[PDB]
Paper text:
Bemnifosbuvir (AT-527) and AT-752 are guanosine analogues currently in clinical trials against several RNA viruses. Here, we show that these drugs require a minimal set of 5 cellular enzymes for activation to their common 5′-triphosphate AT-9010, with an obligate order of reactions. Crystal structures of human histidine triad nucleotide binding protein 1, adenosine deaminase-like protein 1, [name], and nucleoside diphosphate kinase at 2.09, 2.44, 1.76, and 1.9 Å resolution, respectively, with cognate precursors of AT-9010 illuminate the activation pathway from the orally available bemnifosbuvir to AT-9010, pointing to key drug–protein contacts along the activation pathway.
[name] is a nucleoside monophosphate kinase able to transfer a phosphate group from ATP to a guanosine 5′-monophosphate, yielding GDP and ADP. Expectedly, [name] is able to phosphorylate GMP into GDP, but also AT-8001 into AT-8500. [name] exhibits the highest turnover in the activation chain, but the 2′-C-methyl, 2′-F modification slows it down approximately 200-fold. [name] was crystallized and its structure solved at 1.76 Å resolution in complex with AT-8001. Two β-sheets and 8 α-helices, the last 2 separated by a π-helix, define 3 structurally and functionally distinct subdomains: the core, the NMP-binding site, and the lid. The structure presented here is an open conformation, with the AT-8001 substrate binding through extensive contact with both the phosphate moiety and the nucleobase. Thus, on the one hand, Tyr 81, Tyr 53, and Arg 41 share hydrogen bonding with the oxygen of the phosphate, while Arg 44 makes a contact through a water molecule. On the other hand, Glu 72 and Ser 37 engage hydrogen bonds with the base, while Tyr 53 contributes to positioning the base through π-stacking. The protein structurally checks the substrate by contacting both the purine base and the presence of a monophosphate, with no significant check on the ribose at this stage.
Author numbering:
A (entry chain A): 1 to 195
B (entry chain B): 2 to 194
């Protein structure tokens, strides 16, 4: 169980967490790791059990969740997905920082476990800016843009809760936000680099 | 060597561009996009080799004729295009280069020695494409009519044997996105290693 502390990275989808995470991985090859999640969906060609996912049934996933084996879980497109404590510890055993990129529900689920991650939220400067960035993409209809913005406002309002996040990064500019992210993780990166 | 590029096509606004954006956003270390060449003048903040490769019309025309480009088009009096080298540069990083192009682009890429996976993202019907375009695009009926005629030509061409490796019907974005991931699962496994 010795090794780098996991990082829970959250904030509204589209507000920057994904872009910052890609730069983090690109600039620090061999430092970060993703846990092998469990899923109830059928494996696709080329996917391997124990590497891409632990492919289990709904009955097994529910039994393991009830036993307290998971740090977080959620439903996506008719299938269950989740991160086991063992999968996180497996990344930690490789001297890697396990990145848990989750939504607010995921943050709250992980907060209810005995894991001690660093909690970071990446926020847009405003809901207006998030809306303009999402409108610039053309991935939304007015209705889907509205549903996304309502969920994003709930996330933004909850990000202000005292003690919820260790670091809240306001993404005014990607380079500035990335520098704050690297600074927040500098002590754990240094540990994963020199071991 | 490296992951095969993916050429995503289908009618404009039928889902291909939304799926490409989602693919890139949700994945880490797997997908990449190539840096295009352009003959337009660079603007403030633009950097050669990052935003575009900035070349003259004389050079771009010579290079297109030499077979250096996989696809190209004219826009506002300037040439834009994807070179084979820019795609191979993404492939060299063990990444899947995603190419979002129209039918003409698909046919141009078919004429190169690249071996991409060709995927068409289709609306369930022309009527459903029309209702989706009316909901979003703030357009005139005439402009909607011209777009629907181009879309029907694309839908008819998507049925051509051997043109597309996979034809995904975009009933709903999440369903179409799951099928896109299934179609690329073997190449994603290569990029994940
Ligand atoms: C990260 C995702 F949103 C993915 O985009 C989606 C679908 O994954 P796939 O079936 O592998 O295309 O499933 C979600 N997902 C994939 N793995 C997990 C997980 O461990 N926990 C949670 N809460 N969600 C997970
Ligand atoms: C995608 C665009 F329609 C752009 O919207 C337009 C103008 O680009 P810009 O001058 O940078 O706004 O040029 C087009 N364009 C920009 N790069 C390319 C390209 O590589 N291939 C094709 N076929 N078109 C390209």
């Amino acid at each position: 169980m010795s090794g780098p502390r996991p990082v829970v990275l959250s904030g509204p989808s589209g507000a920057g967490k994904s872009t910052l995470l890609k730069r983090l991985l690109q600039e620090h090859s061999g430092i970060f790791g993703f846990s092998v999640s469990h899923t109830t969906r059928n494996p696709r060609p080329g996917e391997e059990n124990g590497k891409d996912y632990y492919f289990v049934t709904r009955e097994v996933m529910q039994r393991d969740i009830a036993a307290g084996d998971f740090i977080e879980h959620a439903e996506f497109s008719g299938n269950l997905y989740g991160t086991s404590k063992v999968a996180v510890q497996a990344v930690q055993a490789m001297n890697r920082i396990c990145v848990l990129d989750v939504d607010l529900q995921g943050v709250r689920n992980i907060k209810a476990t005995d894991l001690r991650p660093i909690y970071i939220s990446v926020q847009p400067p405003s809901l207006h800016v998030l809306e303009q960035r999402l409108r610039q993409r053309n991935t939304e209809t007015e209705e889907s843009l509205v549903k996304r913005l309502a969920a994003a406002q709930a996330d933004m309002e909850s990000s202000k809760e005292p003690g919820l996040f260790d670091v809240v990064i306001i993404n005014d500019s990607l380079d500035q936000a990335y520098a704050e992210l690297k600074e927040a993780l500098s002590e754990e990166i240094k540990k994963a680099q020199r071991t």
